[PDB]
Every structure is written in structure tokens, then in C-alpha cells.
Design a protein around this ligand. Sequence first.
Ligand SMILES: Nc1ncnc2c1ncn2[C@@H]1O[C@H](COP(=O)(O)OP(=O)(O)OP(=O)(O)O)[C@@H](O)[C@H]1O
Ligand SMILES: Nc1ncnc2c1ncn2[C@@H]1O[C@H](COP(=O)(O)OP(=O)(O)O)[C@@H](O)[C@H]1O
Ligand SMILES: [Mg+2]
Lengths: 58, 743, 58
Amino acid sequence: HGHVGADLAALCSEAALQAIRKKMDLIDLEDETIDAEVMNSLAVTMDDFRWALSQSNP
Amino acid sequence: NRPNRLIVDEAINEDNSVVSLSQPKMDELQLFRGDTVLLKGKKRREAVCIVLSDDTCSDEKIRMNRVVRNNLRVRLGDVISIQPCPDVKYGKRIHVLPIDDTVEGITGNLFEVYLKPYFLEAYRPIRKGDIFLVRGGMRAVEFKVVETDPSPYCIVAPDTVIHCEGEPIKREDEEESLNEVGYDDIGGCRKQLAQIKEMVELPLRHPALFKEIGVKPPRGILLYGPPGTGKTLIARAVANETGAFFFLINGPEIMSKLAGESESNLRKAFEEAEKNAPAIIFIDELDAIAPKREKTHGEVERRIVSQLLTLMDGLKQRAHVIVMAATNRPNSIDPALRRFGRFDREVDIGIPDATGRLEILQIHTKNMKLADDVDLEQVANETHGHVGADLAALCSEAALQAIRKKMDLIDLEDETIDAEVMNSLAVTMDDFRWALSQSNPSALRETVVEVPQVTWEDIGGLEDVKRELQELVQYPVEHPDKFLKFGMTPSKGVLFYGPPGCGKTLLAKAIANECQANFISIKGPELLTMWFGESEANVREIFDKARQAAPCVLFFDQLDSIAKARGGNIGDGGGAADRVINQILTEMDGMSTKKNVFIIGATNRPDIIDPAILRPGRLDQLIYIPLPDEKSRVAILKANLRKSPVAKDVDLEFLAKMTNGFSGADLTEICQRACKLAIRESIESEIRRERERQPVPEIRRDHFEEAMRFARRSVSDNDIRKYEMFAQTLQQSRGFGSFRFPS
Amino acid sequence: AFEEAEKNAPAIIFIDELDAIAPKREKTHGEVERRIVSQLLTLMDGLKQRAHVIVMAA
Ligand SMILES: Nc1ncnc2c1ncn2[C@@H]1O[C@H](COP(=O)(O)OP(=O)(O)OP(=O)(O)O)[C@@H](O)[C@H]1O
Ligand SMILES: Nc1ncnc2c1ncn2[C@@H]1O[C@H](COP(=O)(O)OP(=O)(O)O)[C@@H](O)[C@H]1O
Ligand SMILES: [Mg+2]
């Protein structure tokens, strides 16, 4: 409602980072390179955007 | 959670240059005996060794000696990953430098004594930065390989030339690596360390994930908290763990009187950081350097803020440098810094809890030698509000007290101390207790108060009141899981009202010690101020300190002073008295989550207190502290005389019968009078003992009888009716009586 | 001075009128004085406590 363009950019970044967080708990975190299948499965969804909205304040 | 990951294990006979792994694990790793492999360790330290097969070694463990662990800067029980080193070839040459301290006193040539037999017909792989020990000469010498040819993986063949010429390497590098600050040296900040790790380490290691999802990692991190919580510690640990240069900026350093000097300093700092990329820019006291432009009148401050905004905007140019800041009060910072592309992510570092301060104590005491008596759990428990820096200084003071004792033993004139005295040197529990006594908590360095050491047995009677007070503080903190099962939040308010001297103030002093929770005491009118908005501002500061020091007990002694019924006075001291009550109302129950802040109020006259103060949610329980009855009067006299030696002939039970309406303080005066009479008799007796030259071990019956002649009833019968009317209004307000559900 | 102190370890350092050279960094007129205080702190933190050199300030 009161979000300036910087706030919306922060929201999009937070949603993408939340998707990356979802992919965090699966990986070993010590792998030299990440698997191609989980590389392809990574995409921003509505759940990530709603989490960002819940964590979004102007 | 990979086959490469293995648990650290010791070595029975395996030496430095090789490694030994269990044969099934070697087969799982597709590794043959005699193969060269790579070891990965913490702090970005690596070594190259020959893998071996051993039946003694377990499948989940890797056999390495102490020196191999010292190479990787890792301890026993750590998790490390092993990978077969690729394309390892015989070394053309190897440049080895022994430690400078070890070479001293070695008459024979270092190379011939150590290196020539060690590498003869052995083919031992080495990487740059590897240290290996060879027994020989007068003293065992550690050799550090600064240069490897070919770098970094090479095999030392007999034909490969080995030389120890040049200035021997210093132990400073080794001790700096040992003392380098990592994530493990932070205590109580694991929840915040997770977000910091996600912000910093993840983008560096897997930028492919970010490029695939098409997002860029944040560049601004704002750590805010009380001093000593380790924000600078966390920043330096992050800088060291990621192999980035740590650059420190202090707010006073940037500040300068000359025009354009502070911004030039900031630009120079950013330029040096970008040159030393990757690097971490850390700005201590960001609040002092960058306040609100509209709020500040001085031109230089908004000048610095604008320069900082420009520097942050220009920072995001793939410079691989991340700017971090530590401040006490984030709200004092210019809001333009809080936006995205700037200090967008703010991480709250708070007062460590019991387990957090236990972790801090374990971290700082890991090098100190601890006896069996000392237990760090109780040390954490008694440190109610200490911060990490306070805990470190506390451990240092306990150690220094141990040196104080061993000094009192020793003469110090001798140049060399006997080995027996050194063997006697140790650290015990009493040293830590003394450090606890001397050290003060930074959270409450303002509200520190003396402790009369009032304990429950000091209070006589009020057993029902004592039990309720403990459950108020003990239940929510010691058993929070119980409250989540039923789902209703705990009650956090009690008002004590009654005649003066019945024990309201003792219960607050006693509750401070026993429940091991932070205790803030407000003298009744202490908060009020002559300025227009300062009386209410002091109220918000008290409730903010209590929220930061949660679990905290906020004791409002003589609550009737600041909590009056609104509208009683038109002037109300200029209307400020009502505004103080309205401020108190909002903090106790307002538009915020409730922390473990337990408000306790003691008042003589409760009927004047604002009715909004006394509703459930603010001071949930109204407890009446009456005049002690006959049974309680015995307890008060027994508790008061518990310290003093009193004759067994004294019958305390009869005193309670006679003193029908005496208060707790009145009975205390009677014992005080009896003590002075017994002291006065001793003083005159010993004077007669001196006069004849030129008795009273305990208080007898006679002193009490003379004391009772001066006994008075402090609380009048008129006042007692005033207190008993109030308790009757509560009973009549409820209605009915002996409530029971039908059948 | 600190280099000579570590070179001749063990050594003893005494500073006379330290407050004259090291006022409060929050309120300091000259930048040179602030840099002197910064060098004091940097040299204090630089010693790894193996120098066994005690700095005395009056
Ligand atoms: N139940 C009690 N047991 C032991 N000592 C008591 C008791 N009640 C009162 N006293 C003694 O009375 C003195 C004052 O008591 P205290 O300060 O707790 O009273 P209070 O009811 O809070 O009074 P006030 O209304 O003046 O604030 C102390 O010496 C204390 O030891
Ligand atoms: N969470 C913590 N864990 C371990 N030690 C700590 C912690 N916080 C502070 N310390 C100790 O306090 C000392 C100084 O910390 P400091 O930089 O003053 O913290 P802050 O960033 O709050 O100013 C450090 O040497 C460290 O040993
Ligand atoms: Mg009192």
C-alpha cells in the first residue's frame, strides 16, 4: 500500500531469497558444485511472494 | 551429509605426511592404497597426504595425528571432507622454512638433521602452508612449507632439492591462525549467525544459485544492540571465516572539524576496501556518524550522511565487498540509510540468555585450566544480566585472583618459580564467585543496587504469599512449555497493599535474589521530571530497559505516587501526572507483544490508584499483606533472631500472644531493643573489668522484658479499618460466593 | 616505540601526561590527536601478549 519502488525491489529480492532458503535445507551446503536438477527446480512461487509480503514493511 | 565428509579421528602410528582411512571407506571413495588425497579443513586450510588402509580405523572416521589437525586448524570430532587430489606430480623443488623459535639452539645443520632423512625414499606430498614435525636434534623442529613447486600439490622425491636456508618462518602466523576469530567463538548468536551466514557466505560459494534465480545478495547489514554483545566480534569472525580483509571504521575517526574532511575519509576508506576486495567494511557507532538530516542541525552530519548514501549506492558494482554497521539505537539513524540497496537488513543482537552466556563462558574458558569444583552452568545461572564482554572480563578476573593467591604464597624475589608451586597453580569455584561479586552487569550499569541479601527464611509468615510470588516468576521461565500446551499467557502483575511494616518491601527484595531474574527497582516518584515531555520519556526508558533485560522484575515501590486516579486534580501538576499514568498504561498493556517483564507494585493506600492500573493485564493480582497473626508473629521473631545468639530460656511463643496488633517492623524493633540492652550490659561490664585491672554470651530473659516496656504499636487501629474496607470491596465486587458448577 | 619495546622484550613503557595526547575521541579538536589515539589502540591490539611489555600511563 505504501511501498516505493525500492520497497518493491526489496520484496522481490526477499521472495527470491526465500526460494533459495527453501532450497537450502535440501543441499549438503558443502558441495563444490550444485546439482543441475535442483538448479532447474529453483523458481519463485506465490508462497515465497506471500512470505515476502508478510515480511514487507515500507 | 556426503560420502566425502568424515569425522575426525586420532592416529595410533600414522605420521604427519600421510593419512589412513578404513578400507571399506577407501573402496567407497574409489581410492587405492598409496594414493595421494586432499584434506579439506576449517578456516580455508588444506593439506595433501598419502591415503592408507587400516582395520583399526572406523568407516566414518579418518585417522590423523595432532600435527595434521594443526595444519587444517581443526580439532577432534570435527567434520571434514576428503577428495582424491587431482594430477599430483613429483615436486621439482620444495622450499621449507622451520619455525624461528625451534631453530634456536640447534648446533647441527637443520637440513641434514631433519629434512634429509625424513624425505629420503618417502615421496611425501605437501601443500603450501603445511607444517610437519621431524624428531631429531636437541629440540623437535616444526617446518613450514611457504613455497611448493609445482604449486600447490607436489611430491617430495629424493632427487627433489630440500633447503632450509633463509630467515626461519615465525610462529606469529601459526598463533594468529590459532587465535583467528571464527564462527565457533561467538556464543548465543546462532540464530543471528544463521542469517549472517546466509547473507555473506552463501553468495560467495554458490553464485550460480543467485544467477539462476536472478537475484542479487544484500550489501547492507545493520547489527544493533547493547554494547559488549559482540557485533564487532561477529563482523570480524565473518571477515576471517570468508577469507576477506576486515576494515574497521570508528565514528569518531571519521568526524573532523574541517569541511569535506569526514567525507574524504569515508571515500578513502571505501576506496581502500574496494582495492582490498573481497573485504568487509565495518562502521562502529553508525548512529553517531549518520543521524537524521532533519533532526540534526549541524551541517557536517547531513554532509556525512549524504556521502554515505552515495558510497552505498556506488558499492553495488560487483566489488565483492559488503558494508556492515554496529549501532546502539537504530531509530536514531537517518531513515534514508534503512532502504533497499543500503542497510536494508537489520539484525538484532540481544542480551545472551542462560544457555548463550554458558556458551560464551565455555568459549572463553576453553584455554583456562578448570578444576573439578567449577561448573560453568551455575556461573551462567548467577550471571543474570551479564553480557559477553562482561563474561570475558569476569573469567579474566577469576584467573587473576588465582594469580593473587599464588602470589601471596610466593616471594617473587627468585627469578625462577619452583615446579611444585606451578603444579599447585589452578582455578577454583571461589575465584569465579569473587569475580561475580566484583564484576557488574552492563545492562543494569545504571540501575545497579545494593543487595541486603534478603532471603525467604528472613521473611516470617506469608507462606501463601511467598508461594504465589515464586510461581509468578519461576513458572513462565523455567516451564514455558506448560504455558504453550494450555495456550494462555502467564500473568505478570501483582500489587501489594497493607499497613506499613508488614513486609511488602522485603518480598520485593527477596524475589530479586531467589528467582535469578533481572530486578529493576523504581523509587516511587523517581521517574518524574520538571520538563514537559521528560516525565513520560523516563517511563518509556524504564519499560524499554526491562524489556531488553527480560526476564525482568519491575518493582514500583510506593506506586500510589505515580499512579493516581486521573481527573482527581484539574492542574495535576500541570497535567503531567495524568500523562505519566497514560504512559504507564500503554507499556503494561498496549500495542506490543509482552515480554517476561513482571511488574510488582507496593502501596500503602491502594484505593487512590487509577482503576485502569489495577485491571487484569496490568497488575493482575491484588495481594493484601495484613498485620501478622499469632502464628506469623512467632515466625517473624524466629526469623529476626535467626542470626543473633539468643538464650533458650526466651519464650518467643508468649510474645506473639501479648503483641496482638504489632506489625512486622514492631517485632523487629523489640528484638533490636533487646540486642542493644544486651550490648549495653556488655559494654558496662567490660568497663568494670578494665577499672578493676587499673560476660554476656547471649541475650537472656531480662533484656527482652526491659525491651517490651518500650514496645509500641506503630500502626493504629484506625488505619487497619481503612485497609480492611478495601479488601471487602473486592469480595463484594465479585458477588455470590463459594462458586461451584451445577452437579 | 612499540617496535623497540618488542625488540628489547622484556621491556617497560611509561607514558607521561597521556590525557594530553589522548583526550576523548568523541570531543577532539584536531584530527592528528584522533589518529594518535587510533595508533595507541592499534599498537595495544597488535601486541599478541608474548612481548611481555607493560605500558604504564600517568
Ligand atoms: N514478615 C516479616 N518478617 C520479617 N521481618 C519483617 C516482616 N514484616 C516486616 N519486617 C521487618 O520490618 C522492617 C520493614 O519491613 P518492610 O520494609 O518490608 O515493610 P513494608 O510493609 O514494605 O513497609 P512500607 O509500607 O513502609 O513500605 C524490616 O526490618 C523487616 O525485617
Ligand atoms: N556473543 C559473544 N560470544 C563470545 N564473546 C563475546 C560475545 N560478545 C562479546 N564478546 C566478548 O567481548 C569482547 C569485545 O566485544 P565488543 O566488540 O565490545 O562487542 P560489541 O560489538 O557489542 O561492541 C570480545 O573480545 C569478546 O571476547
Ligand atoms: Mg517500602
